[PDB]
Design a protein around this ligand. Structure first.
Ligand SMILES: [Ca+2]
Ligand SMILES: [Ca+2]
Ligand SMILES: [Ca+2]
Ligand SMILES: [Cl-]
Ligand code: NA
Ligand code: NA
Ligand code: NA
Lengths: 5, 472
């Protein structure tokens, strides 16, 4: 996987 | 007479108000008396600087938690690179304090703002579920500016616990009216990513929000897809202005960028709307967005008029949010009828895809049954297929009213041979149409390669009601 966005 | 904020950077918040009309019409809502009082918004991200001079006055510990370290305090982890600044920037866009001589103002500058620290660690399904399901009878609106990798080859969505959190939120959250989940549609534009390959944005339970640049163009980072619902302004090229908000270490930034800024701005507008009518359900809120959003002066080569006369784009959904129109329409809004679900299994046999496959099916939309739908909301094409190079596929769905939704555009970097396993491609573009009649699914190979595969399942899932339409 979970990326900022 | 309403007095606009005096904050030192408010004149730089071009996207909130101005005489040019290139704005979200937020001051019109403020002047109607809606600034967010009594609404609670939570930023699901890497933490929130709860002592920031432009957030402390609106901070709500009840809207906050630290899932990464399992404690109540969502304070970001400070590092030299300031990696954990993302949540604080999102928070200030929603609810930065007004008229306090510091930075600018949030869209809902009198709302209460919290944050869930959940990205700063291993983001498991459980981590996501505990964040989406946090204090759902206190938090009204959740804002998420994160998701699966934007590499243009990922197909990923909520696992079981997170999907359960979505269903529990919309069903029992907010006293049974439903948690409002606002999602940034993604930053994978440079990779030609599709936001329908992101199950969080592609969910019917989230309001997926895309971005427009100051000059009204599709930003370089924008992902196009049919699941997007609407748009707010964000960053663009270096001649275009950007978003002003609270930054890590008690600072003010005028350089927040990407769809990460668009979801919080939408969350703030939705907070103003909820203040104008606290009885709105999660589906009411999506209806309001569909009806009030504005295409005008947003540039795209794919604008199309759907079956009820609304313009819709895969880059922008129904267009720019209009806060003044949202709060106005909310006040006398009549709650929509309970949601119906009509399941139509299309295929009688598997179909080879080859160079091109067209599947036509005439449906009655559950005529004569309690789930009969004459007023569509979301529609899904749940597809199970095999293919040798997934990114060479383009998939379109045409509604009986003639609205062509791109469920999947070519993804040059998606080399996967894993196909799609009951993937629920979603479109918002046929909202309020009558779904009775011929639906057409088109799957084509966009490359010269001799690709091969088989479509083994196509479930058309229709959501909506059978009452209460307005004139196109
Ligand atoms: Ca903590
Ligand atoms: Ca301020
Ligand atoms: Ca994406
Ligand atoms: Cl369902
Ligand atoms: Na409910
Ligand atoms: Na969504
Ligand atoms: Na029809």
């Amino acid at each position: 996987x979970x990326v900022x966005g | 007479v309403y007095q606009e904020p005096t904050d030192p950077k408010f004149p730089q918040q071009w996207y909130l108000s101005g005489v040019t009309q290139r704005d979200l019409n937020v001051k019109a809502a403020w002047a109607q008396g809606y600034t967010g009082h009594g609404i609670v918004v939570s930023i699901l991200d890497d933490g929130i600087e709860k002592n920031h001079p432009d957030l402390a006055g609106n901070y709500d510990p009840g809207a906050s938690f630290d899932v990464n370290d399992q404690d109540p305090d969502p304070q970001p982890r400070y590092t030299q690179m300031n990696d954990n600044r993302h949540g604080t920037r999102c928070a200030g866009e929603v609810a930065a304090v007004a008229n306090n001589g510091v930075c600018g103002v949030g869209v809902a500058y009198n709302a209460r703002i919290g944050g869930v620290r959940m990205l700063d660690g291993e983001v498991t399904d459980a981590v996501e579920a505990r964040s989406l399901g946090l204090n759902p009878n206190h938090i009204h609106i959740y804002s998420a500016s994160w998701g699966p990798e934007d590499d243009g080859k990922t197909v990923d969505g909520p696992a079981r616990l997170a999907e359960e959190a979505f269903f529990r939120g919309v069903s029992q959250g907010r006293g049974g009216l439903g948690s409002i989940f606002v999602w940034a549609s993604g930053n994978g534009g440079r990779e030609h990513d599709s936001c329908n390959c992101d199950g969080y944005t592609n969910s019917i339970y989230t309001l997926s929000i895309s971005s427009a640049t100051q000059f009204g163009n599709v930003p370089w980072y924008s992902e196009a897809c049919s699941s997007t619902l609407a748009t707010t302004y964000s960053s663009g090229n270096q001649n275009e202005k950007q978003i002003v908000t609270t930054d890590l270490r008690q600072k003010c930034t005028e350089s927040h960028t990407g769809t990460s800024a668009s979801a919080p701005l939408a969350a703030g507008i939705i907070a103003l709307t909820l203040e104008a009518n606290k009885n709105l359900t999660w589906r009411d809120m999506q209806h309001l967005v569909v009806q009030t959003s504005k295409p005008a002066h947003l540039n795209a080569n794919d604008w199309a008029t759907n079956g009820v006369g609304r313009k819709v784009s895969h880059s922008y959904g129904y267009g720019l949010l209009d806060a003044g129109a949202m709060v106005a329409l909310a006040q006398n809004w009549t709650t929509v009828a309970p949601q119906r679900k009509c399941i139509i299994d299309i295929l009688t046999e598997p179909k080879d895809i080859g160079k091109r496959l067209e599947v036509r099916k005439t449906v009655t939309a559950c005529l004569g049954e309690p789930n009969h739908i004459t007023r569509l909301e979301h529609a899904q094409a749940r597809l199970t297929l095999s293919y040798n190079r997934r990114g060479d596929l383009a998939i379109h769905l045409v509604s009986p009213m003639g609205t062509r939704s791109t469920l999947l555009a070519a993804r040059p970097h998606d080399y996967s041979a894993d196909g799609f396993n009951d993937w629920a491609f979603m479109t918002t573009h046929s909202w309020d149409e009558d779904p009775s009649g011929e639906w057409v699914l088109e799957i084509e190979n966009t490359s010269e390669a001799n690709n091969y595969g088989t479509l083994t399942k196509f479930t058309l899932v229709l959501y909506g009601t059978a009452s209460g339409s307005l004139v196109p």
